[PDB]
Amino acid sequence: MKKDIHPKYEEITASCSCGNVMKIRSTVGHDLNLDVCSKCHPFFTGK
Amino acid sequence: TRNGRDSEAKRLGVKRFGGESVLAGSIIVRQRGTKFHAGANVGCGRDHTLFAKADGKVKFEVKGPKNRKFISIEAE
Amino acid sequence: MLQPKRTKFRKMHKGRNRGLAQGTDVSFGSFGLKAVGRGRLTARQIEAARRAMTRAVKRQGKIWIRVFPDKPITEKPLAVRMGKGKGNVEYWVALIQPGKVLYEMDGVPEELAREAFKLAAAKLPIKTTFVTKTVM
Amino acid sequence: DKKSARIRRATRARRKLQELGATRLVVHRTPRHIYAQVIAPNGSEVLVAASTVEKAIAEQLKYTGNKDAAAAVGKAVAERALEKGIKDVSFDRSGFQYHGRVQALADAAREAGLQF
Amino acid sequence: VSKSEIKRDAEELKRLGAEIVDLGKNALDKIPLDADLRAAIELAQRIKMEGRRRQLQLIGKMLRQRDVEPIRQALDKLKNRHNQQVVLFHKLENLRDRLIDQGDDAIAEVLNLWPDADRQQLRTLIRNAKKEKEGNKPPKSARQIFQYLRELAENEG
Amino acid sequence: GIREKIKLVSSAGTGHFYTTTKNKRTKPEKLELKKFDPVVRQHVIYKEAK
Amino acid sequence: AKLHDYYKDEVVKKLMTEFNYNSVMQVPRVEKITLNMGVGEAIADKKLLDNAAADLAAISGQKPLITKARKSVAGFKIRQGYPIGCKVTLRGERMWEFFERLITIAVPRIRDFRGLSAKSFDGRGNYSMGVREQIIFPEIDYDKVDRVRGLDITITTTAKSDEEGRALLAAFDFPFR
RNA sequence: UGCCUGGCGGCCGUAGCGCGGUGGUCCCACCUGACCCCAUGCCGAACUCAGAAGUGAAACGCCGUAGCGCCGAUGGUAGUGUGGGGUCUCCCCAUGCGAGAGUAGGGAACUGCCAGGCA
RNA sequence: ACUUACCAACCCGAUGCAAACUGCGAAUACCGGAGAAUGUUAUCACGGGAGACACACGGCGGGUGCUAACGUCCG
RNA sequence: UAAAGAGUAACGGAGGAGCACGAAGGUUGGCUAAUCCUGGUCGGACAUCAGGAGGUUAGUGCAAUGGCAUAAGCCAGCUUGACUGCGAGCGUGACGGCGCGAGCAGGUGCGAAAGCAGGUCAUAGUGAUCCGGUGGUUCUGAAUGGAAGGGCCAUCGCUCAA
Ligand SMILES: [Zn+2]
Incomplete structure (x- = not known):
């Protein structure tokens, strides 16, 4: 990895409204507000 | 279509055959492309005109994995 | 009449009619016509020979063609001295060497084959002969 | 291919040295231990060959393939090539960039007193 | 399309270049000629006759590779042979009596169309022009009126 | 034709110059090129590419 | 590398119990992630490609x-060597980090989502997507977007069959078709 | 000095392609840890590193398989140098050189130097 | 989704042709070396003096022409 | 055409050139396409591709040919050897001329080095002499010293195109 050419790599704490708190390698900013997640998602019930 | 014209075909081709002795610096074959590649003690000119680098007799060999005709000279 | 629609060059050298045959044996039908003389066949002669034999053979069976024009020739216009380029476009011809098959036949008995080939042999400017397919 | 790529890129020097008619020092890298050979100008025979596989040098080093150990195998092959009388070799890139563990291979031979 | 068609076109350009060298130094600066070409012109007349041919070969050489119409068109005005030049002088004198006899109704067109006209000096010139004609004096200043309009005709600057 | 023949004069005090051709229309910038100069027996910069 | 650990502790042993592979490392592994981008018209506006690269720089941790152009075509006004699109390659720990963002938040946020495709296979075992409205990602702000764009994400796998991707994505937990 | 592996060469398909089997102590290729030495118009697939935990999956080596590629006779035929002849737009005769393509057949390589491991 | 006495891209097996095509490939010609025999050195370098630079026909392999020509141009 | 050394004509068949490049040269390092299959979004018969039979049928500034994988094809750093005086030797022409050119002295660029670089993959992109411009040469300077002028070298000076 080369410095000064790639964006920031700051640690953030994301959490959906369901209650799933996880640390995601991203560049959103100070915080990451979410509404859905891999779990608690009504995909296996709609089908 | 206003034809009837041609260029002066200059003197190319195999011109120093194998088995004869030549003096260093003498050209062997004048060719357009690399029909014959330079081999042992043989240099390639600017226009692919092969020239000898040492005194001896020219011999023709077909070397290389691609079956390419090489030109080499041995000291006599 | 018969002629290729596209040609690599508008005209080709005259050429020569020297050499031996290639298609000595028929490999498509049972009966065929083989040229014995040496000469040239034009588009009209090929068309005339095929038309003449077609009226003698019923649709039953099969007909093959082994001759193509493949050769262009030009003619010089009137009141023109030697030079002024090559000739103008009139018609084309084909090269024929004695020994190769001209037409191939199958599907009807030999007696009709003899009659059909005899009618088409006269309109051909060369002497021909009849052959029968052999094993291998 | 992985092997064909380096083979085809290294024959440019192979033809050049063969035309020059001079001996060449060829080395190929292996992720565990490194060899080292010296080739006669004819190419049909070798003159001196010394690698790190031999247990004589395989007991005075930390890891078989590394820059620190490359200066030992390079010096060893150069040391036993001095009594041969060649006094001169020509290095070959052999399809590998000239930086890393190959640095100490040539540097040790150069430091030992080989003119290349 | 034809090698000899280019030849007569090139030869026609050659005699045009031979006309430039046969033109006086005072009128030579009038045409918008580049310095590189201009410097070759002065050496052309002072060279010996055989060198004139070589100079003519030179003058033709770099004159073909650039555009020729503005040079030919500008040469035509100096020779006064282009049709637009002579009519331009016709209207240039056509606005004289339109201005020298009134002095106020003709200046509007000049200033409206040409923004480089110095109306401060033009009115004074007409004042003198009216004075000399009214006092039946020789027209010692009428000539200068035409020079100013002619000078401003080709972007005096 | 379109090309303009130019002369490259040594940046030193000597008058030795080299002849070459550059298209001024596409490359109007002056060249910054150095070439061997026999009179000074060294390498000197050449400039003023018309 | 929380998915890489998840790959190591559960995925590897599940497949040997399914396809009885002789070698433990014979099981295919992820190689790299491909993000392919293409503007509507490159010649119309070069800033669109620059903005598209910026958006790809936001979605990824590295500059794209x-x-x-692969080859100039005279009939479609495309010249050789002209910048025609943007792309980025992710390798190392980037596959596992980027993969979670896709399946945990990105795909579930797709509007009118009923299931990712189960047929887009090349015949060897590499699995390809093309998705619209990349605005679902949180890195790309909804106010700074100039137009509606897209993204092409493909997986690279050493699998020798399409049926083997069925098992691998099942371990990676793609929901359904 | 016998077997296996690796490197550099001789020759350039009887030297390869495809299919099946075989190999991990040793020699090889993937795979790990990633402040640096090497620098980008773009990440450690693919070239640079400090490590042997796993695997021989891919590749590589070896063996068989004549499916393909390839070599290739003998005879025959076309062609042709020389001289003669014919019904001379083209052929024949005496002699010499002898095709291409195809068939039988061969063919799953051989060899030099050096190093390492097993006897 | 069905059908048709219409046409047909591509591939496959076979058959041809090509001066401007050669995955093949002669005989001769040409270059060089070695050798027995023969040939008034017939070989080469230099000097003196020239002539000539309008060719025709026949055979062979060709271009043009209709392999039309006591036809033209080629070796 | 052209008949397997070279060369070989015709109102024989097809064509191109009078430029360009200070990078499109050198060195060093690196890489290898057309066409088609599957998948993939605006996107279509190219947009860029992930996986594939092909190691050049792609490309090689331009017409054609012969070559090009050690790539001469493609990308990046440095770069001026596109240098000065030469140059044994060879080839082509009757000759003027033209081309190849190992190697020497000096100073350079590339890479660590071995080495390469006296232009562009090559074959057309050109013009001999006489006479003109510039610079250098105290080379000469029609009594002496200069000067004028002349000579030599490089240099731009042709549609001298018959
Ligand atoms: Zn949730």
Whole structure:
């Protein structure tokens, strides 16, 4: 990895409204507000 | 279509055959492309005109994995 | 009449009619016509020979063609001295060497084959002969 | 291919040295231990060959393939090539960039007193 | 399309270049000629006759590779042979009596169309022009009126 | 034709110059090129590419 | 590398119990992630490609690369060497980090989502997507977008069959078709 | 000095392609840890590193398989140098050189130097 | 989704042709070396003096022409 | 055409050139396409591709040919050897001329080095002499010293195109 050419790599704490708190390698900013997640998602019930 | 014209075909081709002795610096074959590649003690000119680098007799060999005709000279 | 629609060059050298045959044996039908003389066949002669034999053979069976024009020739216009380029476009011809098959036949008995080939042999400017397919 | 790529890129020097008619020092890298050979100008025979596989040098080093150990195998092959009388070799890139563990291979031979 | 068609076109350009060298130094600066070409012109007349041919070969050489119409068109005005030049002088004198006899109704067109006209000096010139004609004096200043309009005709600057 | 023949004069005090051709229309910038100069027996910069 | 650990502790042993592979490392592994981008018209506005690269720089942790035209075509007004699109390659720990963002938040946020495709296979076992409205990602702000764009994400796998991807994505937990 | 592996060469398909089997102590290729030495118009697939935990999956080596590629006779035929002849737009005769393509057949390589491991 | 006495891209097996095509490939010609025999050195370098630079026909392999020509141009 | 050394004509068949490049040269390092299959979004018969039979049928500034994988094809750093005086030797022409050119002295660029670089993959992109411009040469300077002028070298000076 080369410095000064790639964006920031700051640690953030994301959490959906369901209650799933996880640390995601991203560049959103100070915080990451979410509404859905891999779990608690009504995909296996709609089908 | 206003034809009837041609260029002066200059003197190319195999011109120093194998088995004869030549003096260093003498050209062997004048060719357009690399029909014959330079081999042992043989240099390639600017226009692919092969020239000898040492005194001896020219011999023709077909070397290389691609079956390419090489030109080499041995000291006599 | 018969002629290729596209040609690599508008005209080709005259050429020569020297050499031996290639298609000595028929490999498509049972009966065929083989040229014995040496000469040239034009588009009209090929068309005339095929038309003449077609009226003698019923649709039953099969007909093959082994001759193509493949050769262009030009003619010089009137009141023109030697030079002024090559000739103008009139018609084309084909090269024929004695020994190769001209037409191939199958599907009807030999007696009709003899009659059909005899009618088409006269309109051909060369002497021909009849052959029968052999094993291998 | 992985092997064909380096083979085809290294024959440019192979033809050049063969035309020059001079001996060449060829080395190929292996992720565990490194060899080292010296080739006669004819190419049909070798003159001196010394690698790190031999247990004589395989007991005075930390890891078989590394820059620190490359200066030992390079010096060893150069040391036993001095009594041969060649006094001169020509290095070959052999399809590998000239930086890393190959640095100490040539540097040790150069430091030992080989003119290349 | 034809090698000899280019030849007569090139030869026609050659005699045009031979006309430039046969033109006086005072009128030579009038045409918008580049310095590189201009410097070759002065050496052309002072060279010996055989060198004139070589100079003519030179003058033709770099004159073909650039555009020729503005040079030919500008040469035509100096020779006064282009049709637009002579009519331009016709209207240039056509606005004289339109201005020298009134002095106020003709200046509007000049200033409206040409923004480089110095109306401060033009009115004074007409004042003198009216004075000399009214006092039946020789027209010692009428000539200068035409020079100013002619000078401003080709972007005096 | 379109090309303009130019002369490259040594940046030193000597008058030795080299002849070459550059298209001024596409490359109007002056060249910054150095070439061997026999009179000074060294390498000197050449400039003023018309 | 929380998915890489998840790959190591559960995925590897599940497949040997399914396809009885002789070698433990014979099981295919992820190699790299491909994000392919293409503007509507490169010649119309070069800033669109620059903005597209910026958006790809936001979605990924590294600056993306600009691709040149493969070959000029005279009938479609495309010249050789002209920048025609943007791309980025992710390798190392980037596959596992980027993969979670896709399946945990990105795909579930797709509007009118009923299931990712189960047929887009090349015949060897590499699995390809093309998705619209990349605005679902949180890195790309909804106010700074100039137009509606897209993204092409493909997986690289050493699998020798399409049926083997069925098992691998099942371990990676793609929901359904 | 016998077997296996690796490197550099001789020759350039009887030297390869495809299919099946075989190999991990040793020699090889993937795979790990990633402040640096090497620098980008773009990440450690693919070239640079400080490590042997796993695997021989891919590749590589070896063996068989004549499916393909390839070599290739003998005879025959076309062609042709020389001289003669014919019904001379083209052929024949005496002699010499002898095709291409195809068939039988061969063919799953051989060899030099050096190093390492097993006897 | 069905059908048709219409046409057909591509591939496959076979058959041809090509001066401007050669995955093949002669005989002769040409270059060089070695050798027995023969040939008034017939070989080469230099000097003196020239002539000539309008060719025709026949055979062979060709271009043009209709392999039309006591036809033209080629070796 | 052209008949397997070279060369070989015709109102024989097809064509191109009078430029360009200070990078499109050198060195060093690196890489290898057309066409088609599957998948993939605006996107279509190219947009860039992930996986594939092909190691050049792609490309090689331009017409054609012969070559090009050690790539001469493609990308990046440095770069001026596109240098000065030469140059044994060879080839082509009757000759003027033209081309190849190992190697020497000096100073350079590339890479660590071995080495390469006296232009562009090559074959057309050109013009001999006489006479003109510039610079250098105290080379000469029609009594002496200069000067004028002349000579030599490089240099731009042709549609001298018959
Ligand atoms: Zn949730």
